Design a binder for this molecule. Structure first.
Ligand SMILES: [Cl-]
Ligand SMILES: [Cl-]
Ligand SMILES: [Mg+2]
Ligand SMILES: [Mg+2]
Ligand SMILES: [Mg+2]
Length: 266
């Protein structure tokens, strides 16, 4: 009776020897565990056109690390990606399996939840990515193979130091993301960020009130950061921008994906 959506490239890193059969078996076990009536496997192909258009430096740190690999280190990664390609090929014989050049799996997942989540009792997201918790609701949860935790909306403070999704999204916008090369406001950690949000509202409401009262240096920093906050919200507000992120590579591509997903449902 549930929907299960797999962050498939993310799951691939469990194995990072062909692993296609093992990969598919894992997904089957998961589908059983989570009573999945429907399982959809997603993968990352290329780079996020939507986010690179807004921030050319997006994941630039990761690109730099890839560029500094030796030829032999690179060849090994290519092998992993070949085995992963084979895993997706095999997976496609068994489950609906999607990749879209220039679109992050994150955006595809967010869109699926919005489009068909209402037809299922519960939605289970299979991802180690905390970013995916921007999708949590009373009927959408996440499972992580690295931490072994099941992530629920009711436990958002335990996991993310905020009480709800709106706050989570705003906190990410304020703090940025070191891993993905998104700059944050200097001097604002999770505590101060949560406190700011609880006082002034979400990031859009914060922007509307700049400059905010307060003599502390982090407030002065925040007051100077209108542009950064607005841009960051676009980069991190996965539910708001998922449709735009897909449409970035062509409206026709989005239309095909919609058609494909609606076919799977029902
Ligand atoms: Cl909940
Ligand atoms: Cl702006
Ligand atoms: Mg991702
Ligand atoms: Mg992500
Ligand atoms: Mg992140």
């Amino acid at each position: 009776r549930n929907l299960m959506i797999v962050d498939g490239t993310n799951l691939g890193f469990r194995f990072k020897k062909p692993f296609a059969s093992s990969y598919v078996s894992t997904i089957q076990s998961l589908a059983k565990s989570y009573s999945a009536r429907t399982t959809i496997v997603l993968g990352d192909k290329g780079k996020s056109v939507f986010r690179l258009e807004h921030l050319p430096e997006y994941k630039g740190n990761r690109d730099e690390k890839y560029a500094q690999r030796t030829e032999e280190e690179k060849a090994l990664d290519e092998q992993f990606f070949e085995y992963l390609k084979d895993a997706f090929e095999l997976c496609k014989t068994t489950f609906p399996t999607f990749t879209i050049r220039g679109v992050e799996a994150d955006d595809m997942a967010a869109y699926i939840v919005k489009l068909i989540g209402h037809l299922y009792d519960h939605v289970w997201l299979i991802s180690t990515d905390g970013d995916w918790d921007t999708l949590l609701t009373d009927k959408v949860s996440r499972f992580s193979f690295t931490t072994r935790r099941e992530y629920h909306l009711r436990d958002m403070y335990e996991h993310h130091n905020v009480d709800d999704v709106e706050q989570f999204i705003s906190l990410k916008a304020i703090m940025g993301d070191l891993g993905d090369n998104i700059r944050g406001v200097e001097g604002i950690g999770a505590k101060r960020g949560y406190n700011i949000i609880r006082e002034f509202g979400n990031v859009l409401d914060i922007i509307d009130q700049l400059p905010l009262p307060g003599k502390q240096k982090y407030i002065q920093n925040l007051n100077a950061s209108e542009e950064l906050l607005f841009r960051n919200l676009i980069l991190v507000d996965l539910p708001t921008y998922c449709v735009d992120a897909i449409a970035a590579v062509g409206q026709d591509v989005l239309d095909k994906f919609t058609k494909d997903i609606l076919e799977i449902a029902e």
